[PDB]
Amino acid sequence: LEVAIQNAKAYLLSTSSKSGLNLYDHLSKVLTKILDERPADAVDIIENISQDVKMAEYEMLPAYEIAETQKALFL
Amino acid sequence: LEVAIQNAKAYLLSTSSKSGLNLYDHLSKVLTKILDERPADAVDIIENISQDVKMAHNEYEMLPAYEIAETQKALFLSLPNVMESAYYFEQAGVGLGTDETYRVFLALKQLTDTHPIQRCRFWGKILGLEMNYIVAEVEFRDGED
Amino acid sequence: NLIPQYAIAVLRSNLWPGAYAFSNGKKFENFYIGWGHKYCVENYTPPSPPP
Amino acid sequence: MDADSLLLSLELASGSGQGLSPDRRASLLTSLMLVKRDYRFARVLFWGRILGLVADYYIAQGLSEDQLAPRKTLYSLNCTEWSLLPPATEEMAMQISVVSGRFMGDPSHEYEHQIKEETRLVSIIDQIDKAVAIIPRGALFKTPFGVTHVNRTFEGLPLSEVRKLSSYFHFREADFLDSLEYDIPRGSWSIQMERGNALVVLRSLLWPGLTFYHAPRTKNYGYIYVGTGEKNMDLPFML
Amino acid sequence: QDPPIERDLYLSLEDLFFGCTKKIKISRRVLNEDRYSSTIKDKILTIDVRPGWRQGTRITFEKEGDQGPNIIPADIIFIVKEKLHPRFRREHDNLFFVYPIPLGKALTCCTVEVKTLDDRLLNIPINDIVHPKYFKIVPGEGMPLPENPSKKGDLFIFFDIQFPTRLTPQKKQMLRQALLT
Amino acid sequence: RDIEVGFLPWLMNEVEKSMEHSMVGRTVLDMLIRDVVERRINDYEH
Amino acid sequence: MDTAYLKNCFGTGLTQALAEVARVRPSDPIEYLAHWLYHYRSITVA
Amino acid sequence: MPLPQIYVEKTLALIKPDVVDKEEEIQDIILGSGFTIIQRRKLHLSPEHCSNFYVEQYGKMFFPNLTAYMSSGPLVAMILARHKAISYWKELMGPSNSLVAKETHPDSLRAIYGTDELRNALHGSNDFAASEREIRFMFPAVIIEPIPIGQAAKDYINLYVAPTLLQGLTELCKEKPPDPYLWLADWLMKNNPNKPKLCHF
């Protein structure tokens, strides 16, 4: 099947212009992060490792204000 | 290099405890279907096609955490107010927390019920290497055990 | 209840949910922690207008 | 709520103020572990309390693999003595509609409107679960095997997503679950921030006593119904 | 021809609940071409017992039983039969438990301790007055159905009430004031 | 009637090709493991 | 022949079926095939 | 084997009910030695299972004690895999007879945990083909062997699958039933030659 695996290397991936990512690079990063000791249930985790590799404080400012006024309680 | 690569599979072949599959066989199947259909659309479908691949007399073991639970239900079935005193201790960061304090309180209740004790005080807790101690200061009424 | 000789008398009003009264037998205190409403078995009738 | 809500007072941390004493909390920890032993549930969450006029029904709910299964209810009056409550149906939902009033501690109590208090307990717990059992957005992931599991990689909601009712789900049969933004009345849910806004507290107004816990920084969540056990039909007047 | 031997083999409740396996050594009356020998070619027949097989379920092994010179062997190892247990009586996919409740516990709140075939323990509330025809259904917790091992029938808990064997005259007044008013 | 010559020969060829495609998938996966991990030990020590 | 009827009816299903059965090598291939066909509906029709 | 592909060797490894209590130390030595565990599972073999598991040697090992020591409580089976898996696991084990291993191999796990000839602490694959046979027995639906890509798959199908599938499809062609898959699958379940006919009545 040497011609077939040659075609397999030939595909992965003529770069998809819709996203600019490669199956070889994407799955390579996915597996690289997996080989840092994900657990035996890693089969159920690749669905959002794929999301993370595909992806690759002001919202909580009201938290600081309530903290700021509460300093006077014990100061 | 060889030991690293077969260690990499023998990791990846590790069967999941919930689905019963392993990541290596799943990746083989998903690459098989990807190479079969050739999406163009190859990267975007990797999630959906993974869902598509997942689409297509039992013994039981249990931990040592229920023999303690077997032991400690008897707690819930002439002392001092141990919770009150610990609350005074807890006002300066001293005590075992309310849960452990109440557990020791019920243990002291069992001790008082078992033996003829005039006063049964929570003396202290001496920390240990394998198992800690829960010491009870006891003063007997009749002198008998 | 497991150690009744150090119990505290709990009171649940059932007219103002969240309203509580407490006493160790010597001292006492009161505390409300509800929504501020009176309990009613019947559904809330808006009062009729004047005749 | 899970056992993590019984190692610390997560219930009273919501500011609703109703919860379990440390007596009941430790007793419940041991008893729910023994319930998970005796009944082979995947998890055993403390459902909450039905505050009666004589005694309070401490309620626990069994969770299967398979978490949207018809969850198995348990009750206990003295906390530790857990007993398998029967499951609910539609007839028993229609049966208790003629009865109103506060629960009695003895579940053998009879109403002449006969009707057993156990049937009331079963039906009211079912109604509370179908109405106001909360799941945060993304905490549960529909597995491809036709089964719902914990989304064990779930990160708590962003603080932008905290304030929306769309980020919270009805924990029942139906992202698969129905969101709270269609739970009529439109104002039927109260969202508030406690404890430095590391704590989201979401209380039902239609079923008072429910308070849903969530820590946005992590995946610590849960709901407990500690209350009288009636439906606030006065809610549109009160809003 | 000669009939198949309708052998009966007894399976306890856990075997038909978990789906065990069984081996039955068979006869040595297998014939060669000489048509007078008595040897054996397959010592053991194995049956994969699946969950929920009811009593009378026929498992047949064609061409495996005893054989004469000019007949086809056949055998019906085995008719599913149920052993006595401590205790559930096998009916159509339902388990019938008998709890020897004492009187005084029958008339008031009671909790029935049921070990199941899963090795799970059940505390079933009994808040009804237990007269000697009462039974509580614990649904969806019987044996698995043969047509669907995921689904299971209902458990029935009947009661054998133990009346008192002797009563004090004080206890007679106790009872007369309680029950007849 | 005579499906023994008709259709099963085709299906045996299709099982052979599908298992060949499966082996291609397993091979491609194995090359992916090599590429990722050899990139890991070589670059990690540098 | 009857090839065309069963050309249309089964197609890819039997191919995947015996491919999986030959790969797995179970003790009872026939029961495995029946269960797999059941599961194959349960994914495709639903 | 001298393909582009690279190869994992796999071996079965068991712990008996008189040694399962020390499962954790045995797993610690297994992992520390360099093995990688693929799957765990808790077993309880009835005597029928014991007769089938040793079926390559049950016709010579007429030891009722050997069946009891699998049936007298649960087992802990594992798949282990590392560089020269079976020989390394044999080296840790030592002689199969623990009575010899106790005095001659102090380092052996069988000496540490075992008792005697039949109360051997561990059982595992003594041969690669035996490894495939026992692993395919105990943990179904786990791929362990090279895939039969070529004529071997055709021989497997023609010897096990085709003699039933041909005849069933032939009757399916005579009937031409609607939604033909029910007819085929229910036919295969009902008239399996390797199983008896079940009459659920």
XYZ file of N, CA, C and O in Angstrom, chain G residues 15-38:
96
model
N -20.197 -4.547 4.210
C -18.763 -4.307 4.098
C -18.177 -3.868 5.433
O -17.225 -4.480 5.937
N -18.765 -2.830 6.040
C -18.302 -2.385 7.353
C -18.501 -3.473 8.399
O -17.670 -3.625 9.305
N -19.573 -4.264 8.261
C -19.869 -5.311 9.231
C -18.769 -6.358 9.281
O -18.170 -6.586 10.340
N -18.465 -6.983 8.144
C -17.448 -8.026 8.190
C -16.051 -7.439 8.320
O -15.153 -8.127 8.806
N -15.836 -6.183 7.912
C -14.549 -5.551 8.190
C -14.312 -5.449 9.692
O -13.248 -5.842 10.192
N -15.320 -4.984 10.433
C -15.202 -4.906 11.884
C -15.090 -6.292 12.511
O -14.332 -6.483 13.467
N -15.839 -7.271 11.995
C -15.807 -8.608 12.591
C -14.460 -9.280 12.335
O -13.919 -9.954 13.220
N -13.904 -9.128 11.130
C -12.592 -9.689 10.837
C -11.509 -9.000 11.652
O -10.547 -9.643 12.089
N -11.638 -7.687 11.861
C -10.664 -6.982 12.684
C -10.736 -7.445 14.138
O -9.704 -7.713 14.762
N -11.947 -7.546 14.689
C -12.099 -7.879 16.102
C -11.774 -9.349 16.351
O -11.113 -9.688 17.341
N -12.212 -10.236 15.458
C -12.192 -11.679 15.678
C -12.882 -12.039 17.001
O -12.219 -12.388 17.980
N -14.207 -11.929 17.070
C -14.920 -12.373 18.273
C -15.111 -13.883 18.279
O -14.921 -14.574 17.277
N -15.496 -14.396 19.450
C -15.768 -15.823 19.583
C -17.018 -16.245 18.820
O -17.097 -17.397 18.379
N -17.989 -15.342 18.664
C -19.243 -15.614 17.957
C -19.423 -14.527 16.900
O -20.052 -13.492 17.156
N -18.841 -14.708 15.704
C -18.999 -13.679 14.659
C -20.433 -13.421 14.239
O -20.764 -12.284 13.882
N -21.296 -14.433 14.264
C -22.646 -14.275 13.736
C -23.475 -13.376 14.651
O -24.181 -12.464 14.192
N -23.391 -13.613 15.963
C -24.069 -12.746 16.923
C -23.513 -11.330 16.861
O -24.260 -10.351 16.994
N -22.198 -11.209 16.660
C -21.578 -9.896 16.522
C -22.127 -9.166 15.303
O -22.388 -7.960 15.356
N -22.319 -9.889 14.198
C -22.890 -9.278 13.000
C -24.311 -8.800 13.245
O -24.681 -7.698 12.821
N -25.125 -9.621 13.912
C -26.508 -9.224 14.174
C -26.569 -7.980 15.058
O -27.304 -7.021 14.760
N -25.774 -7.965 16.132
C -25.751 -6.812 17.024
C -25.220 -5.576 16.309
O -25.712 -4.460 16.528
N -24.226 -5.754 15.436
C -23.677 -4.623 14.703
C -24.704 -4.046 13.737
O -24.770 -2.831 13.554
N -25.481 -4.905 13.071
C -26.506 -4.402 12.159
C -27.580 -3.626 12.917
O -28.054 -2.577 12.446
N -27.971 -4.132 14.096
C -28.874 -3.381 14.972
C -28.309 -1.998 15.296
O -28.990 -0.973 15.134
